[PDB]
Amino acid sequence: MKRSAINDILGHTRQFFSQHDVHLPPFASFSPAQWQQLDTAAWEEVFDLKLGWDVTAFGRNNFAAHGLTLFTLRNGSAKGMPYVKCYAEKIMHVRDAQVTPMHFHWRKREDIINRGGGNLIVELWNADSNEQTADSDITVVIDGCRQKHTAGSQLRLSPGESICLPPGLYHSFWAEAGFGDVLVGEVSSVNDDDHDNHFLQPLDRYNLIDEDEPAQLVLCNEY
Amino acid sequence: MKRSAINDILGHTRQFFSQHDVHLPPFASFSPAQWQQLDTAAWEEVFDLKLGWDVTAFGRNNFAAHGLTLFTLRNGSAKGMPYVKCYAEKIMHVRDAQVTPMHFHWRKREDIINRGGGNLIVELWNADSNEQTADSDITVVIDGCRQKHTAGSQLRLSPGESICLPPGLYHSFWAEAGFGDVLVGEVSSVNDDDHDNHFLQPLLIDEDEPAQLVLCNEY
Ligand SMILES: [Mn+2]
Ligand SMILES: [Mn+2]
Numbered sequence: 001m002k003r004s005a006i007n008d009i010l011g012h013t014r015q016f017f018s019q020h021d022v023h024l025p026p027f028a029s030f031s032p033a034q035w036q037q038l039d040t041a042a043w044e045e046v047f048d049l050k051l052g053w054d055v056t057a058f059g060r061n062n063f064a065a066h067g068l069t070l071f072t073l074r075n076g077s078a079k080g081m082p083y084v085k086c087y088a089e090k091i092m093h094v095r096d097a098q099v100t101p102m103h104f105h106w107r108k109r110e111d112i113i114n115r116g117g118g119n120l121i122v123e124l125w126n127a128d129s130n131e132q133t134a135d136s137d138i139t140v141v142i143d144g145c146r147q148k149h150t151a152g153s154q155l156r157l158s159p160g161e162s163i164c165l166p167p168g169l170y171h172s173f174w175a176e177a178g179f180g181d182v183l184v185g186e187v188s189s190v191n192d193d194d195h196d197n198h199f200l201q202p203l204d205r206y207n208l209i210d211e212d213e214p215a216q217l218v219l220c221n222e223y
Numbered sequence: 224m225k226r227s228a229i230n231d232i233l234g235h236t237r238q239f240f241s242q243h244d245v246h247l248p249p250f251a252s253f254s255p256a257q258w259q260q261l262d263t264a265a266w267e268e269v270f271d272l273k274l275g276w277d278v279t280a281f282g283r284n285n286f287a288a289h290g291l292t293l294f295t296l297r298n299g300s301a302k303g304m305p306y307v308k309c310y311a312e313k314i315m316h317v318r319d320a321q322v323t324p325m326h327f328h329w330r331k332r333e334d335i336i337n338r339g340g341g342n343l344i345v346e347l348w349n350a351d352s353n354e355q356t357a358d359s360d361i362t363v364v365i366d367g368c369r370q371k372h373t374a375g376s377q378l379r380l381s382p383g384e385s386i387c388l389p390p391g392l393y394h395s396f397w398a399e400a401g402f403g404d405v406l407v408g409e410v411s412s413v414n415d416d417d418h419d420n421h422f423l424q425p426l427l428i429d430e431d432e433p434a435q436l437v438l439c440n441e442y
Contacts, residue, residue, distance in 0.1 A: 021244045023339050023383035025366035046367035074334050074367075074385065074410060085332060085387065087310040089410045109308060111297050116244050143248035144269035144297075160246035162297065164308065187297065187312045187410055 001063065001207045006055050007216045013069045013093040020116050020183050022091060024071060027052065032215050035223075049075040049083060050193070050220040058101050059204030068100050069093040070186075072220055078107075078192040088191040092184040094120065097177040102133075102200040104170045110188035112173065113162035118180035120157040124149070125170040131198065133170055140164065170200060193221075224428055228286070229278050230435045236292045236316040243339050243406050245314060247294060250275060255434050258442075272298040272306060273416070273439040281324055282426045291323050292316040295439060301330075301415040313409040317343065317398045325356075325395040325423040328388075333411035335394075336385035341402035343380040347372070348393040354421060356393055363387065393423060 017024065027046060030038075046052065054070040057063040070092045076085030088108075094100070096118065104127055114120045124140065125133035139148050141164045142155070149155070156176065157163060162185075165171050175182040193205050206221050240247065250269060253261075269275065277293040280286040293315045299308030311331075317323070319341065327350050337343045347363065348356035358374045364387045365378070372378070379399065380386060385408075388394050398405040420426075428441075 021339055023337070025383050025385065027366060027368075028383070042369050043367060045364060045369065049367070051367050073336075074387070086412050087332075087334075087410055089334075109310075111310075111312075113296075114246070116246055141268060143250060144266060144272070144274050145250075146265050146268065160248050160251070162248065164297070187310055189309050 001055070001057055002210045002212045003215055004213045005063070006209065006219070007213065009055055009063070009069055010053060010217050016093050016181060016183070017071075017091070022115075022183065024091075025073070028071060028217075030218065032218055035218050045083060047223040049077065050223070051075060052220040053217055054193075054220050055207075056205060057207050058199075059207065064095065064098060066099050066101060067095070068098070069095075072191065076190040078190055078195070080190075086189055088186070088188045090186040090188075090191070091115070092186065094173065094175045094182040094184050096175050096179070096181055099174040100172060101203060102170050102172040104198050105165075105167050105196050106198060107167055108189050108191060108196050109164065109166055110186055111162045111164050112157070112171075113185035113187065114157040114159050115183040115185040116159045117175070117182045119176040120173055120182045120184060121154050121176050122157060122163060122171055122173045123152065123154045124165075125151055127168055127170050133200065138169070140169075224278070224280060224286075226428055226430045226434055227432045229428070229438070230432065232278050232286070232292055233276060233436055239316050239404060239406070240314070245338075245406065247314075248296070251294060251436075253437065255437055258437050268306060270442040272300070273442070274298060275439040276436055277416075277439050281422075287318065287321060289322050289324060290318070291321070292318075295414065299413045301413055301418065303413075309412060311409075311411045311414040313411075313414070314338070315407040315409065317396065317405040317407050319398050319402070319404055320400045322397045323395060325393050327393045327421050328390050328419050329421065330390055331412050331414060331419050332387065332389050333409050334385050334387050335380070335396065336408035336410065337380040337382050338406040338408040339382045340398070340405040342382075342399040343396055343405045343407060344377050344399050345380060345386060345394055345396045346375060346377045347388075348374055350391050350393055354423075356423065361392065363392075 075088040077083040128134040298311040300306040
């Protein structure tokens with residue numbers, strides 16, 4: 001990905017958040033110059049836990065078709081030390097028809113929430129012992145309502161609805177085509193994108209960056 | 224507390240949420256009649272973990288001066304079983320100058336978040352061995368920025384800002400007088416209001432009209 005594209009994507013996502021009355025912490029708007037002037041001793045948590053902006057095309061070449069934009073608001077340490085917090089939160093922008101590829105988490109349990117906008121479609125499979133998709137029925141809880149569904153079921157989350165995805169459950173999601181961008185919330189146990197994602201297809205969680213213009217903001221993986 | 228007052232409070236809070244583009248799950252709007260027709264097997268998590276609406280005047284007679292309106296969106300079991308989820312979330316409405324009295328949690332660690340509206344003022348004290356306020360410096364992290372402050376400091380959270388409150392840290396909060404109502408988020412470890420709250424000053428519904436909604440303590 002080009003830095004110019006990242007600058008553009010983040011500008012648009014910040015506007016989308018503002019449109020939904022979403023407010024981010026002050027550090028969400030820091031320029032690289034402002035980051036350079038901070039007391040690094042007071043800000044270790046942001047750096048250590050990779051709080052902040054995340055833009056990915058999942059190692060591929062078409063962000064619009066496969067990609068995601070996220071802001072990690074709070075987190076704890078993957079091991080539990082030195083940041084003892086068990087929980088994490090993200091706020092995400094899923095663009096119309098934009099797909100987050102099929103994956104499960106080894107450890108993280110997450111509630112994926114449609115905070116507003118379009119409709120979030122979530123496709124679900126159990127993983128078999130070969131780490132492939134299983135033919136077995138899935139059991140999930142959608143806003144406290146427990147239910148069983150066929151393997152590969154595609155569930156629609158309207159604004160306000162959320163689903164709890166236990167570790168090991170394969171999931172892919174997208175904003176239903178035509179119904180608009182979706183504001184997605186994530187409230188979960190600790191997030192570790194370095195090690196806790198298993199994609200069905202072997203892919204990279206982050207993209208390498210072509211530095212074609214000055215960065216307006218700093219990504220959480222480049223502190 | 225009169226049911227008419229609760230109906231009005233929840234009506235106003237739902238409007239406030241809508242004005243802030245906050246969207247709640249379908250169960251947030253269930254009438255008592257609708258709750259009666261639910262499959263009790265499929266919905267046990269809502270009942271068991273007390274998800275949903277909460278309106279409190281903190282046992283007193285002045286909601287406007289001391290009160291809070293909350294919706295618990297997700298939760299887990301206090302002791303980790305049978306609901307293993309370790310996290311919880313609430314969305315709350317703090318009315319202008321409305322105070323939540325000084326309290327700490329024995330177990331819950333929470334991030335209190337100004338999701339929008341006015342400014343949230345949070346007053347903080349360490350707890351002593353005798354469950355009184357200590358005069359020791361407080362160490363808190365505001366949006367990943369670690370800082371130390373004097374005992375009893377009143378810290379301002381503007382929209383977007385959040386503070387992590389570890390267990391045992393006394394806290395009281397209110398919407399800064401004149402800056403408007405505040406939409407408050409809480410993302411935390413498991414919530415247990417039955418046992419996990421200690422108020423510094425230790426803490427019935429009159430059905431005068433039909434209930435429009437059901438509160439989380441009356442399942
Ligand atoms: Mn996931
Ligand atoms: Mn509290």
